[PDB]
Amino acid sequence: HWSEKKLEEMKERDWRIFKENFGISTKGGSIPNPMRNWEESGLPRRLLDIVYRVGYDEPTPIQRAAIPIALQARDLIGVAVTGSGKTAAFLLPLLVYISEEYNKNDGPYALILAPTRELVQQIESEARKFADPLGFTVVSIVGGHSLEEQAFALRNGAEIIVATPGRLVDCIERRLLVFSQCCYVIMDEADRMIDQGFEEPLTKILDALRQTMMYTATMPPTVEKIAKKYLRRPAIVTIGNTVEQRVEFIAGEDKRKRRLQEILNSGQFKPPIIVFVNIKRNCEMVAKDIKSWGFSTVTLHGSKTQEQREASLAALRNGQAHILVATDLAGRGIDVPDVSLVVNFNMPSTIEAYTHRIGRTGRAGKSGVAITFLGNEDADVMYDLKQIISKSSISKVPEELRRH
Numbered sequence: 468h469w470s471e472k473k474l475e476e477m478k479e480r481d482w483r484i485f486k487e488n489f490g491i492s493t494k495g496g497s498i499p500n501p502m503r504n505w506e507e508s509g510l511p512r513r514l515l516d517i518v519y520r521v522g523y524d525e526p527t528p529i530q531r532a533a534i535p536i537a538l539q540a541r542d543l544i545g546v547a548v549t550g551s552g553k554t555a556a557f558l559l560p561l562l563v564y565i566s567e568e569y570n571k572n573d574g575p576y577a578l579i580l581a582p583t584r585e586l587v588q589q590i591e592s593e594a595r596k597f598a599d600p601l602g603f604t605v606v607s608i609v610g611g612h613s614l615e616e617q618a619f620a621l622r623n624g625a626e627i628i629v630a631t632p633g634r635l636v637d638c639i640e641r642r643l644l645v646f647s648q649c650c651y652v653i654m655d656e657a658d659r660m661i662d663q664g665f666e667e668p669l670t671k672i673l674d675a676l677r678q679t680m681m682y683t684a685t686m687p688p689t690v691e692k693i694a695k696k697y698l699r700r701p702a703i704v705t706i707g708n709t710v711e712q713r714v715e716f717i718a719g720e721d722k723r724k725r726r727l728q729e730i731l732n733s734g735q736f737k738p739p740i741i742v743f744v745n746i747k748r749n750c751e752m753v754a755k756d757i758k759s760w761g762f763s764t765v766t767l768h769g770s771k772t773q774e775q776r777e778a779s780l781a782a783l784r785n786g787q788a789h790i791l792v793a794t795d796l797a798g799r800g801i802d803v804p805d806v807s808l809v810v811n812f813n814m815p816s817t818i819e820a821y822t823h824r825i826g827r828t829g830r831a832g833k834s835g836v837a838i839t840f841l842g843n844e845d846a847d848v849m850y851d852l853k854q855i856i857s858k859s860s861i862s863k864v865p866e867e868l869r870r871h
């Protein structure tokens with residue numbers, strides 16, 4: 468008795484289905500629910516009918532996920548590949564905050580940084596068809612053109628200025644330009660910023676002190692540092708884009724708990740560690756048993772809400788809790804970073820769930836270890852699993868799948 472996303476109030480479960488469909492994920496920061504449609508974007512209709520006019524009938528996942536949480540005074544990180552639609556995703560929320568605002572002030576209200584001149588000019592244009600109807604200007608600071616034409620922003624608007632970190636710094640220390648009013652900064656593709664040595668020049672641009680946002684495809688340690696030092700209360704949107712090693716054991720029905728004890732006491736793996744189980748009663752029973760082993764375990768269950776469920780996942784990240792027990796429902800959507808080990812105490816009847824639970828261990832790369840317990844009571848999956856292990860022939864040998 469359910470309606471498949473043709474509902475008015477929705478349910479937390481339904482929201483989770485929503486995200487899983489569009490593949491988007493978020494790290495908790497008291498986050499607002501994502502957009503289904505433009506008609507209540509939180510944006511004014513004069514901007515919406517422009518969104519329609521350009522032919523953007525459908526929101527890209529990054530747009531629907533990033534915009535609603537940007538409309539509130541919170542910084543966001545946009546982990547997404549190029550072509551995601553992320554440009555308009557940071558443009559629209561900027562435009563609505565452009566006016567919350569005068570002509571004569573002289574010194575940009577907002578700044579947009581990009582690794583390449585091509586991007587700076589793409590952002591310029593993509594912004595211009597949104598800005599020109601709104602009656603204000605966007606200026607690109609780029610070389611390779613006549614300087615007189617650049618110095619041409621005569622009415623001295625430049626409510627938004629888009630430029631390379633490496634050329635804007637050129638006009639900054641000489642103080643040929645001022646950021647007295649730049650209280651909104653956007654960092655598109657900080658990947659190739661660092662990949663093209665804009666690190667220190669970018670850091671030079673730290674003036675004024677409100678929102679700052681950051682769209683990338685990746686977060687290497689250089690990029691993560693740049694993030695933490697300048698992003699107050701980060702909100703991390705992510706979009707779904709082999710890694711896993713897939714060790715597998717054959718065992719009796721419940722000798723498996725002693726093996727789990729052995730693994731945990733091996734110390735080979737570093738908490739957080741996720742151990743899945745097919746049955747709820749066995750979920751809470753093994754969790755209590757791991758509690759008796761002295762380990763710090765946290766249970767994520769539907770009786771409580773996201774406010775507390777999120778608190779629990781955060782309680783997993785922050786090291787107050789080490790091991791997590793779960794049913795398939797308990798954490799289909801969860802995205803706890805760099806978990807050392809996925810223990811399938813019971814392999815699920817459906818095969819896609821296995822792929823799903825092991826599918827979340829490496830962000831861009833991790834230990835990716837997944838031990839899966841097996842028996843003859845779970846024979847139906849055996850023939851399938853083998854070939855899927857071959858599909859990820861990388862990182863693992865099935866070694867002993869001589870039967871089905």
Ligand SMILES: Nc1ncnc2c1ncn2[C@@H]1O[C@H](COP(=O)(O)OP(=O)(O)O)[C@@H](O)[C@H]1O
Binds near residue numbers: 525526530551552
């Ligand atoms: N809401 C939308 N719906 C459909 N197409 C869009 C939307 N927003 C942007 N586009 C188009 O998608 C193309 C991809 O560009 P874009 O995704 O903005 O690059 P990036 O991912 O690097 O920001 C652009 O040419 C743009 O015209």
Ligand SMILES: [Mg+2]
Binds near residue numbers: 549551552553554
């Ligand atoms: Mg885009």
